[PDB]
């Protein structure tokens, strides 16, 4: 970034517009696309594009925690941490198969295609979209310690999800804006990243340095953020329902449990 282009972006925010048109409280239009396999999601945010892929395999539990399974994320450009586990979004106790000896290890490998900021934020949508769209093999665990499981023979089962946490990252100047672009991002003087779920709980907040921020300016951010998080939760949910419909053209005629 040249001294000019920086002066231009920064002055514009002192006025108070953003070069790409959107306002200070505006999250880029989020574009979710589901792939062939369950757990395969692609999220697009302006010029930011991320792909996540949920995978799953038997493992193993830790000696500490016999009654719960494992959840790993791995990111690889070509906060996110707390949220997912912290929320009880993914119920790891529901990933126990045999206490102490067998359980599910779940993975998300997140892969950044193009980055224009929104790394943390897009990452989190990607995992959560991935996590909710993914399905486990079906197992028979009669045998106490013997696990049977496949494949097309049985239809896969979803993971049970207790919240949908979403992050919103505020960049600050010396004045706050939501979902900075890369050029916006490079000139920022401070960062704050609020995670919430639609249930209205603050799943986690993170601020270390730089610009000292008021109690009220935190609150103001959490609200500006929440309003977004609804939209994105309603979006993620609709795009699943629309995906599920597309895969099950003829659900209507196939239900066993029919009401009287």
């Amino acid at each position: 970034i040249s001294a000019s282009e920086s002066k231009f972006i920064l002055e514009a925010l002192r006025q108070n517009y953003r070069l790409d048109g959107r306002s200070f409280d505006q999250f880029r239009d989020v574009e979710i696309t589901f792939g062939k396999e369950f757990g395969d999601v692609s999220v697009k945010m302006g010029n930011t594009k991320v792909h996540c892929r949920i995978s799953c395999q038997i493992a193993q539990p830790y000696e500490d925690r016999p009654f719960e399974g494992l959840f790993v994320i791995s990111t690889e450009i070509s906060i996110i941490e707390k949220s997912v586990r912290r929320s009880g979004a993914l119920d790891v106790e529901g990933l126990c198969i045999v206490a102490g000896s067998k359980c599910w290890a779940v993975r998300a490998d997140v892969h950044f295609l193009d980055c224009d900021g929104g790394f943390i934020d897009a990452s989190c949508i990607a995992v959560m979209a991935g996590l909710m769209h993914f399905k486990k093999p079906d197992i028979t665990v009669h045998g106490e310690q013997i696990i049977v499981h496949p494949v097309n023979e049985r239809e896969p089962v979803p993971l049970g999800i207790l919240h949908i946490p979403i992050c919103v990252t505020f960049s600050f100047f010396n004045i706050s804006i939501i979902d900075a672009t890369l050029k916006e991002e490079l000139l920022r003087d401070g960062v704050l990243t609020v995670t919430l779920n639609k249930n209205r709980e603050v799943v986690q907040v993170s601020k270390a340095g730089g610009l000292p921020m008021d109690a009220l300016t935190l609150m103001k951010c959490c609200h500006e953020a929440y309003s977004i998080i609804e939209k994105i939760t309603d979006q993620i949910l609709q795009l699943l329902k629309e995906d599920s419909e597309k895969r099950n053209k003829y659900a209507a005629m196939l239900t066993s449990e029919n009401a009287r």
């Binding site: 270390a208 610009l211 000292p212 109690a215 935190l218």
Partner: protein
């Protein structure tokens, strides 16, 4: 099993909801090992903090380094959070061509180390004679049901969501806010209110010792 918060409002250690735990300090604990140094007990917490002062590499700035030892992920996290804070806070533009190495040793921990860590560092730096914008003081609050509990021991962090804040001087602006488990949005602000008051008290206690040690000679 315990009673985290009796209906008579008494906690496991007998404190009330808005009461800090014991907080004692020392400065210049290592006159030869360091340019500044602090020893600090906060409840059962116990930290030696040592700043090996401005020494011989940005020509515009000084470089800061926090190194924290317990007696892997969680550590590097704690570290890089504290470097971030005190990068804003120390006047690194007063000490060009230089390094400030902050070396911490945590002897014992029992809830709210991060907050404890902050106070220790702040003490070590004032002792170092290193200049900084304001005094950041640190503290944790936890949410028990509808009631905030103002200075969480380890048994308290386990049974409720915690919030750590680092506060800039007697002001209400937070250098650091770490909300670490779930808290309803409609209860966050009140929790922050208590953090800020307790943080201010910590500073007030910090100020006393700095007064005290100053009167020797």
């Amino acid at each position: 099993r315990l009673e985290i918060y009796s209906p008579e409002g008494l906690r496991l250690d007998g404190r009330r909801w808005n009461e800090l735990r014991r907080f004692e300090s020392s400065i210049n604990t290592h006159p030869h090992a360091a340019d500044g140094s602090s020893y600090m007990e906060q409840g059962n917490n116990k930290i030696i903090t040592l700043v090996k002062g401005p020494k011989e590499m940005d020509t515009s700035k000084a470089l800061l380094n926090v190194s924290v030892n317990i007696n892997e992920r969680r550590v590097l996290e704690i570290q890089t959070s504290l470097v971030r804070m005190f990068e804003k806070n120390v006047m690194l533009n007063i000490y060009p061509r230089t390094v400030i190495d902050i070396e911490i040793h945590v002897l014992e921990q029992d809830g709210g180390i991060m907050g404890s860590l902050i106070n220790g560092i702040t003490l070590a730096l004032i002792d170092a004679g290193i200049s900084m914008f304001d005094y950041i003081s640190g503290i944790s609050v936890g949410l028990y049901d509808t009631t905030p509990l103002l200075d969480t021991n380890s048994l308290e962090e386990n049974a409720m969501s915690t919030v750590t804040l680092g506060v800039v001087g007697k002001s209400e602006k937070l250098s650091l806010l770490l909300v670490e488990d779930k808290i309803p949005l409609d209860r966050l602000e009140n929790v922050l209110a208590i953090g800020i008051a307790g943080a201010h008290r910590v500073r007030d206690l910090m100020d006393e010792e700095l007064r005290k040690h100053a009167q020797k000679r």
